[PDB]
Each structure stands twice: as C-alpha cells, then as structure tokens.
Ligand binder design. Structure first.
Ligand SMILES: NC(=O)c1ccc[n+]([C@@H]2O[C@H](COP(=O)([O-])OP(=O)(O)OC[C@H]3O[C@@H](n4cnc5c(N)ncnc54)[C@H](OP(=O)(O)O)[C@@H]3O)[C@@H](O)[C@H]2O)c1
Ligand SMILES: NC(=O)c1ccc[n+]([C@@H]2O[C@H](COP(=O)([O-])OP(=O)(O)OC[C@H]3O[C@@H](n4cnc5c(N)ncnc54)[C@H](OP(=O)(O)O)[C@@H]3O)[C@@H](O)[C@H]2O)c1
Ligand SMILES: C[C@@H]1CN(C(=O)c2ccc[nH]2)Cc2c(C(=O)Nc3cccc([C@@H](C)O)c3)nn(Cc3ccc(F)cc3)c21
Ligand SMILES: C[C@@H]1CN(C(=O)c2ccc[nH]2)Cc2c(C(=O)Nc3cccc([C@@H](C)O)c3)nn(Cc3ccc(F)cc3)c21
Lengths: 412, 412
C-alpha cells in the first residue's frame, strides 16, 4: 500500500511552474504517498476571482497544519494587470504569506557533482537565513530636498523623558535619510530558527553583521545570539562537534569562498531584505535552489522553489513548442516539506521517501540526464546539442522510472 | 639609458607579498625605469614601531604625488597582536589610506585565454565598484529600552515645514533603531569616479540599484548619475562611442552573465548582505585581480593586488619549502600605477613600458608558464603534476626573461 503522509497544505501556481507542479504530484508524489491534502489554487485568475481571499486562507491553513508547499506565482505589475484584466495590482502571495506567518527565510542549493558552481570546493550547501520582519515592517526613507536637520526621537510609552538624536544637519544641498528598527523578539526568533537549523543539519552556525559600523544596532544581534547560545544551545552543539561564531560580513564572504560549505549563515543585512543575493541568482536561475520559511513556533514551515514561473518557457509551451524546464527546485520544495511533516509526526516511511526522492533527483542529473539549462552549464549554450538534454516531460519520465527502481531496492 | 618615470609613492608590505614585491622591483621595474620613488615601509613591525605614523605619511604622499602602488599588508587581529607583541590592534592601512584620500574602489580582473572564468564568454573585465562611506561616517543607532514610538523628522532651514515619519511604535518590548543619511556630495563623488573610470578605459558605464525597499535612496543615486551624465559627460562618452545606463540589479546580473565583459559596473551598496563587489574578490584569491582606489578628482590613483599577504605560502617559505605564489596581481598594481603616472605626465615611453609588462605577463601564462593555483584551475588540484607549473622564483625568472626579449624587440 501507499505511505500515509498526513496533513499537507499545497498551493498551486502559475504558468510553467503550474504545469511542472501537476507533473510532480501525478508522477512522483501521488503514486507513493496518500495525503490529507489542503489544496489552494493561487493561480492569478483565482486570486483575482476571490479578491485575493484564497491567499489569506492558504496562509491560515499553513498556520493550522504546519506544513506548506508552494508553487511559483505571478506577482502583478502594470503589464500583468492588462494581460489578465485584473481588478487590482494584487500584492505578492509570497509577501502576504510571509507577513501572516513570520519567520526566517533559509536558502539551500541542490548540489550535483557534474554541475558547475561559483567555488569548485563547495561540496556541501551554505544555508543562508534572512529574517522576515514583514511588509508591516515599514522601512522609512525620504528625500532631503535641501538644508535642514534630520533628527530621530524616542518617546517612551510611560510618559518619561523623550530622547532626540541628531542624524545630520544638512548645511548645504540635500540628500536622503532613513529610519530603521528591530524588536528584540524578532532577533530572538531569528536566533532560535538559526540554532535549530544548525542542530537539525549537524552543521556549525555563523552570524554575520556590520557591528563595527552599527555598534549598538548590530551589537544587539551579536549579544542576543551569544546569550541564547550560552544559555540554551552550547551543550547540544558541543555534543554534535559543531559551534556558533559571529563574523563581520566582509570576513564571512571571504571565508565562505575558501570553504567546502556545510554551514548555516544567519545574515543580518541593513535593509531587512529576505531575497537571495545577486550572485546566488546565477545558480537559482538554473532551478537548483529552494527557499524555506521557518516560523517562530518551531513547528511551521513553508517551502518553495527559489525562482519564478518561467514565463519564457510557458510561451513556448502555449505555442506547442518543446520546452526543457528544470523541475528540481519544485521537487525539493515537496521533499523539504514532506521531510518536515515526517519529523513532526515521527513518520519513518515518509522520511525515507522524501530522502529517496532527493537522492533520485541528484543521481539522475549526475548520471547525465538533465534539462537544457544544466547541459548549457557544463558545455556552454553555443555547444549544446539536442542529444545533451531531455525535454521537461522526458526528464520527469526518467525521474519517475528511477524513483520506481530506487523504492524497489529499498524493499530488499 | 632607462625610462625617466617620475614621482611614484610605493608602500612595502608583509610576508609572502613583501618577498614578491622586492622581486618585482628588482627584476621587472628597476632594470628599465628610474623613479623619484617615495617609498614607505608599511611592514607590520614598522607600523608598530612608528605608532602607525608611517601609514598616515604614505597616505599624505599619495595625495601630494597622485600615484600610489601598495603591497598587501597584515591587518592585526588578537592572534597577530600576540605573534608580533603589538602595542595596539592597529587599523587596516587600506582603511586609513581610503579615509584620508576618499574615492571609490574598483576591481579589475586579469584575463588569460587558457584560465577558466565564472562565465566562459567573459573576454574583457567587468570593472566593479560599490559606493561606500568612509570611517568618518557616524550612523545614528541606539537601543530602544522599552515600549514607545520612534519617529524621524525633517525640519527645513527656512522653518516653513516639518515632516515627521513614524519609524515604529514599539508596543511589545524594546529593540534597536537607527537613523541613516547620504549627502548628495557623496553620491556626486561616486558618480564622478565612475564616469572618469569609464572614460579612462573607453568602456560603457552601468549603475545598478535594487529599487525594492529603500526606493527614495535608490532613486537619488539614479537621478544624480543621470543629471551628471547629461550635464558633464554625455558629449565625451558619445565621442568615445560609449554610453551610460541605469539597470535594476536582477537585469544587471542576467546581462553580465550573457556579456563578453568590457564595462564599468557602479553598484549602489546594500551593506550587510553578500555584495557583488565582495564576491568579485574571490577571483583575486588566484592572484588575478587588482583593487584601484579612484578619487573623483580623476588625478589621484592608489593600486594594489586584490588578495592578502598569502600567510600560508609565507609559512612554507619560512620552513624552506617550495612555494608557487602568483605575482600577477602585484605586477598589475605597478603597471596600473605607472600607466596613470604616464597619463598625468604625457610620458609615452612609460606608457609603452607599463602596457608591455601587462602583455608579457598575460603572454607568459597563455604560453603555458604559470603558478600552481592557475595550473589547478585548468586541470583540477588532484591532477596537477610538478611539470604543470613554476615555483614563485622560476615564474618571476620567466617573466623577467620574456620582458627582456619584448623590450629588445621594441627597439628594432
Ligand atoms: N517564488 C515566486 O512565487 C516567484 C519568484 C520570482 C518571480 N516570480 C514571478 O515569476 C514570473 C516570471 O519571472 P521571470 O521569468 O522574470 O523569472 P524566472 O521565472 O525565475 O525566470 C527567469 C529565467 O531563469 C531561467 N529559469 C528559472 N527557473 C528555471 C527552471 N526551473 N528551469 C529552467 N530555467 C529556469 C529561465 O532562463 P532562460 O530564459 O535563459 O531559459 C527563465 O526565463 C513573474 O510574473 C514574477 O512575478 C515568482
Ligand atoms: N589588501 C590587503 O592588504 C589585504 C587584503 C586581504 C587580507 N590581508 C591580510 O593578509 C593576511 C593573510 O590573509 P588570508 O590568508 O586570509 O588571505 P590571502 O592572503 O588572500 O590568502 C588566502 C589564500 O588565497 C590564495 N592566494 C591569495 N593570493 C594568492 C596569490 N597571489 N597566489 C597564490 N595563491 C594566492 C591562497 O590559497 P591556498 O591556501 O589554497 O594556496 C591563500 O592561502 C592577513 O594578515 C590579512 O589581514 C590584506
Ligand atoms: C552559497 C550560495 C548557494 N550555492 C551553494 O551553496 C552551492 C552550489 C553548489 C554548491 N554549493 C550556490 C551559490 C552561488 C553560485 O554558484 N553562483 C553562480 C553565479 C554565476 C554563475 C554560476 C554558474 C557557475 O552556475 C554560479 N552564489 N551563491 C551566493 C554566494 C556567493 C558567495 C558567498 F560568499 C555567499 C553567497 C551561492
Ligand atoms: C563580474 C565580477 C568581476 N569579475 C570579472 O570581471 C572577471 C573575471 C574573469 C573575467 N572577468 C570576476 C567576478 C567574480 C568571480 O570570478 N568570483 C569568484 C568567487 C569565488 C571563486 C572564484 C574562482 C577562484 O573560482 C571566482 N565574481 N564577480 C561578481 C559577479 C559574479 C556574477 C555575476 F553575474 C555578477 C557579479 C565578478
């Protein structure tokens, strides 16, 4: 019989990723796993039709059932409003879900021995976590049109003495100014997620800051992480022969690049961005990275591919043209989700399945069966021949055949 | 007779780079060029002995003579303080020089046809530099001890308006808050350095901004660069068949990835995250990148290798073990410095020399004579045989022999 997988929240998306998402379910998941599936259609037409209520209901379902797996979705701009005749320029469903759940966004690459990367020596992923403070977390920047003083004041709730700090007195010309903040509770949540991620993986954790420039602001992150480590995690880390260390951002980047990988990196940046850094995009654009939101309760996770809907491929698909879209990141959104479900329910069979599907995916690519973009990584796009890659459907078929063999081997 | 090279500020450094720096001068520079050499010993023992006065004097000399060439130096940490029994944990000489001169740092790769790169199609360097305020910049950050409102106000000098922006109302606990600013003059300086770098190279310039969180900050950089281009550089650029364009980071990364290179990339800074400028320095670990500080004046230049003192190789050298340290980046700090000196003085003979030394260096590697790290790039470190590379001294000897032949050919 099939594995009884339990309660999973699944969010359907848009364009090419919507096609691949259905292929993953029909070919890799449903033949082996039975789910109490809480399925939400976050397709742009359905979000428009429901006045974005579907997104809010999907976020509430993840909060209730603790496991969410999300397909890439269209974030509307002026062009999308005209394309689909939208009622409004709906907000990013990622942003809406992230604001409702809160938590730390961790980014993890899928590594294949034959697939080039920035550093040859990187053999284990470098998991970078950025805390989501929200879109209710208002960054306060403005133009200073001309001379005058910019001041920042703190007024205690208890009526006690107001404190005023001079940011700058613009004596000639103008510029720009900004105000930023972080609550201690948000730093504490970021710390807990980071320490638990490091223990979960059995890897060391590094926190990077600019505490040389932001002595009080970044110093608070450094002190809170250190206090939490000393009081709640030091014993556990020493027992796994791992450690926690703070690093300045410049030292951390240089050290990571001379590393073999295999560490957690809690990244405290200035603007509170949670998106991948610029250079990670050269690898995320391959369909080889996931984004996992780890919520402050230590029970709720939301997993998704770290790429968009692949519009360019969807247009080819709409014209009946052959496509070669990499489903790896979307598959790993499912496996990372299912592995978390297995951990919460102590479901050994589901935990085995999720790990086996990850192994099958990496092994298929490593055996030389891959989509066009991966073949172009190895050979160079001008040198790629049709015999070097598999189309979307052929690649999914190969994964399905390989998964069947793998699960048969597991029986004996 | 030798070339009369003029006034150059030279800073001696530490460990393996100090050995190579003397070899460069004795074998590649001094047999051909006579200099009014302003030489400063920035060796860690001398900085300690002079209470870092030597560093400040070397920075003043660069300001006066416009051309500086710097050897890699030790930046002290707790371990270095113990190693050399230092009086203080002296500040980075780079930081001290940068604070005194001002300007923007640009990274420039040295490219060899047989040396693999991140993108195969990169045949000309992508000269990347980011905005950065000096150490003089004081951020207004503070602890928020408990609940209360944090607000940032702008009061124009003419007393007619007052704009108050709510940063955050801390309802539950305290945290941290900051006020930050950018003066228009600082953005203008970054723009001028970038436009002058593009004209100096005869290449187009691109400015990148994120435009996702601090849009008014990003917008000010975009407007200032465009205004400066239209009013002071557009004619000069059109005359050199080059151009200036603004691009969003994501578009810039994708474009750079499909480019052949040969452009200036000025990055708006996003401190605390993994920046393209810090990532670029990883190519410097091969000894194949320089860092050039360019002041907005267009007259003052400080050049250095984009790597450190190579301590690991220095320890081998101390034990009498064979080393293979790449001197290319240190040689290009000299040639980039000497080429700038030649431009300021209209010295055709010095300009020929600097370019000939750059050609000799690239040609030697391309003919298959290189250090171990470059041989490992091509073949993979486990497959490198002793016959695939030259040790430090053998490589310098080959460059010296090749330079002698090249300059003899130039005469006849
Ligand atoms: N997480 C999300 O929900 C999410 C994230 C980002 C963007 N978006 C949405 O995505 C839509 C389209 O964005 P976009 O096309 O600019 O970005 P994108 O879908 O990530 O695609 C950019 C390019 O990267 C390549 N690529 C990305 N993922 C790939 C994969 N799985 N397999 C193969 N190639 C892959 C393709 O390159 P080539 O064209 O060279 O083949 C593609 O055209 C937008 O409407 C945006 O709102 C959603
Ligand atoms: N601009 C500067 O003055 C500057 C910049 C950075 C660091 N530093 C100082 O440099 C010292 C050493 O720092 P570090 O060892 O972390 O950094 P590093 O000197 O850049 O060396 C790191 C590694 O990069 C490789 N490498 C760098 N340059 C090389 C070259 N020319 N040829 C061959 N291999 C090269 C070597 O890798 P392998 O180990 O695999 O052989 C080396 O061990 C420290 O005291 C630091 O403060 C100064
Ligand atoms: C560390 C994360 C995630 N990854 C991994 O963990 C990984 C993959 C395989 C083994 N490990 C990949 C990766 C890459 C990457 O490969 N960029 C890339 C860019 C252009 C062209 C190409 C082509 C060759 O594919 C690649 N960059 N970053 C951002 C980063 C960089 C420097 C830091 F210090 C910090 C963050 C990352
Ligand atoms: C573009 C700039 C400057 N470059 C050049 O111009 C260049 C070099 C050769 C010909 N041209 C090099 C470079 C590098 C680079 O090579 N980093 C690196 C890091 C670790 C380890 C290694 C090697 C040892 O494995 C390399 N990264 N960036 C940042 C970037 C990357 C991808 C983007 F899409 C956008 C920004 C850059």
């Amino acid at each position: 019989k099939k594995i009884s997988g339990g309660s999973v929240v699944e969010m359907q998306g848009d364009e090419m990723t919507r096609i691949i998402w259905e292929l993953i379910k029909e070919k890799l998941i449903f033949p082996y796993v039975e789910l109490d599936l809480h399925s939400y259609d976050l397709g742009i037409e359905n979000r428009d039709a429901t006045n974005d209520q579907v997104t809010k209901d999907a976020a509430e379902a993840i909060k209730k059932h603790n496991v969410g797996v999300k397909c890439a979705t269209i974030t509307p701009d002026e062009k999308r409003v005209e394309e689909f005749k939208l009622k409004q320029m709906w907000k990013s469903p990622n942003g809406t879900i992230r604001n409702i759940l809160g938590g730390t966004v961790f980014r993890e690459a899928i590594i294949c021995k034959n697939i080039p990367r920035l550093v040859s020596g990187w053999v284990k992923p470098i998991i970078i976590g950025r805390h989501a403070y929200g879109d209710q977390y208002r960054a306060t920047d403005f133009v200073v049109p001309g001379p005058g003083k910019v001041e920042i004041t703190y007024t205690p709730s208890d009526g006690t003495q107001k404190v005023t700090y001079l940011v700058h007195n613009f004596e000639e010309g103008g510029g720009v100014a900004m105000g930023m903040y972080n609550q201690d509770k948000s730093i504490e949540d970021f710390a807990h997620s980071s320490f638990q991620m490091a223990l979960s993986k059995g890897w060391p954790l590094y926190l990077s800051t600019k505490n040389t420039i932001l002595k009080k602001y970044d110093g608070r992150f450094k002190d809170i992480f250190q206090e939490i480590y000393d009081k709640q995690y030091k014993s556990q880390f020493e027992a796994q022969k791992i450690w926690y260390e703070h690093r300045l951002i410049d030292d951390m980047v240089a050290q990571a690049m001379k590393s073999e990988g295999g560490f957690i990196w809690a990244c405290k940046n200035y603007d509170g961005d949670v998106q991948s850094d610029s250079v990670a995009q050269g690898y995320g654009s391959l369909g080889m990275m996931t984004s996992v939101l780890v919520c402050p309760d230590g029970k709720t996770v939301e997993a998704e591919a770290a790429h968009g809907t692949v519009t360019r491929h969807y247009r080819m698909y709409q014209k009946g043209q052959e496509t070669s879209t990499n489903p790896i990141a979307s598959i790993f959104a499912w496996t990372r989700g299912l592995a978390h479900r297995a951990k919460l329910d102590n479901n050994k069979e589901l935990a085995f399945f999720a790990n086996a599907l990850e192994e099958v995916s990496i092994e298929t690519i490593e055996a030389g069966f891959m989509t066009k973009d991966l073949a172009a990584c190895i050979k160079g796009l001008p040198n790629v021949q049709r015999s070097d890659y598999l189309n979307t459907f052929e690649f999914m078929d190969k994964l399905g055949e390989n998964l069947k063999i793998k699960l048969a081997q597991a029986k004996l």
